[PDB]
Design a binder for this molecule. Structure first.
Ligand SMILES: Nc1nc2c(ncn2[C@@H]2O[C@H](COP(=O)(O)OP(=O)(O)O)[C@@H](O)[C@H]2O)c(=O)[nH]1
Ligand SMILES: Nc1nc2c(ncn2[C@@H]2O[C@H](COP(=O)(O)OP(=O)(O)O)[C@@H](O)[C@H]2O)c(=O)[nH]1
Ligand SMILES: [Mg+2]
Ligand SMILES: [Mg+2]
Lengths: 257, 249
């Protein structure tokens, strides 16, 4: 019965803080999740994790023993973990009627998780055993430039395609910067064309014009919410987007896994 | 035996000029193509077309274009059969499209037309890039994302064609696609902060996109680069057989 929520997003966008607040929110609803941390580099985890990659794998140690830098040691830790993925999935399976959701925190860097073989295997394993939803975390205060916003959205699209999972775009940190502008840009594309024309010269506008149709087709697939992981604002709405995406998953997405 | 080349690109990038030069180049190689024009809005066509959408077909701009495409797509079976009849008399079928790219690949009728050709012949997308306009790293990247979305939408092999190299050489772009750290450097210099950060993660994603493409620089004015383009076409026809034919029935 359990569904899996995988938090994915740019470093510093708030994945871990979002995870903490989601956890407290679900517990307050008397539906505490099963919590997994897959960031091997993190120093302390500000919530209780049921499975922590750092337990089986000592991140500094893999750095030293394998002689690689940050990105390498993160991906190596993920490889080692992915070795035990069958066991992990079975563990979650045992708990699948005791917990409404399994929620998963990922490495800080998005590409360490979705463009590594091992991260893709981990994701595929979860997708193949439970309804699984990608919560794509957006650092809202940093995406006010229309070109930055659009690049970020193209990236989310590529992730949507790569993972073949339903996506919820989560504009985080609304306590600093509200997400109205972005919702509008995704809803009324002529506003985005206006922002682009003002901000950027010429060809961009024209480019963005054709992309209007393409982007609209992307945005229709998404669910979209604004949250503050500091205040807990918007999380009820996120969980509604989760239930919707679990439904869609059943119909549309289950066939791909 | 014939393969189909569909020219797709931003308005003004040179699709029609590229078609003219490709036509003359192929005729010079004693392998004249079967020529199709699918731009209903064009005033004169600077080459001889075997099938012109304007013949059968005489809101606003994009509405009328898409409507013309609908009407045309009604006769797509006939069109395909016509090309099929000629498939051993012509080495290639080359296709010019509406000025606006979304009129053709994000309309139902344009998608049907493309699917029909993909289902009957090896079909390759020549994605035409207006090189002088894509010197800004962000503009270039947006354009490339767009090409990627097209690659996915059409499920066809893609050749990125940096056109107008007589005005602006395509070295910089080839470099950006080949050596990604150079692109990161161009972005860091040109743009602040979050965009650079963005472009870092995308490095892996974009590398995966670029590895699928073939890439050529041409001048449709001088004919420079077209031999190379046709080599890319042959390569893509091979790939099409193996990898792509399974996605089209
Ligand atoms: N104002 C505000 N700051 C946030 C929020 N979420 C995260 N942050 C801050 O952004 C930084 C990165 O957060 P973190 O949870 O570590 O992001 P992660 O790298 O994606 O896992 C931290 O200093 C957070 O306190 C939020 O909802 N509101
Ligand atoms: N220098 C140069 N200019 C070109 C080339 N190809 C096209 N052009 C110019 O760019 C425009 C081409 O428009 P066109 O071929 O109709 O683009 P379309 O809308 O995609 O069909 C014209 O102004 C041409 O003079 C080229 O290879 N070199
Ligand atoms: Mg974190
Ligand atoms: Mg034209």
């Amino acid at each position: 019965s359990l569904s899996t929520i995988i938090c994915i997003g740019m470093a510093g966008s708030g994945k871990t803080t979002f995870m903490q607040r989601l956890n407290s929110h679900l517990r307050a609803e008397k539906t505490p999740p099963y919590v997994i941390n897959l960031d091997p580099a993190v120093l302390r985890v500000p919530y209780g994790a049921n499975i922590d990659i750092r337990d089986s794998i000592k991140y500094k140690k893999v750095m030293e023993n394998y002689q690689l830098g940050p990105n390498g040691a993160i991906v190596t830790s993920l490889n080692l973990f992915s070795t035990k993925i069958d066991q992990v999935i079975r563990l979650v399976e045992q708990k699948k009627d005791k917990f409404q959701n399994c929620i998963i925190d990922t490495p800080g860097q998005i590409e360490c998780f979705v463009w590594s073989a091992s991260g893709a295997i981990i994701t595929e394993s979860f997708a193949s055993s439970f309804p699984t939803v990608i919560a794509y975390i957006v650092d809202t205060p940093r995406n006010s430039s229309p070109t930055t916003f659009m690049s970020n959205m193209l990236y989310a699209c590529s992730i949507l395609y790569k993972t073949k999972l339903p996506m919820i775009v989560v504009f985080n940190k609304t306590d600093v910067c509200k997400a109205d502008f972005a919702k509008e840009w995704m809803t009324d594309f002529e506003s985005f064309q206006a922002a682009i024309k003002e901000d950027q010269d010429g060809y961009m506008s024209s480019l963005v014009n054709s992309m209007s149709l393409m982007l609209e087709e992307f945005y229709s697939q998404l669910d979209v919410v604004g949250v503050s992981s500091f205040t807990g604002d918007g999380f009820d709405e996120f969980m509604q987007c989760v239930d919707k995406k679990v439904d869609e998953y059943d119909q549309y997405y289950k066939k791909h896994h």
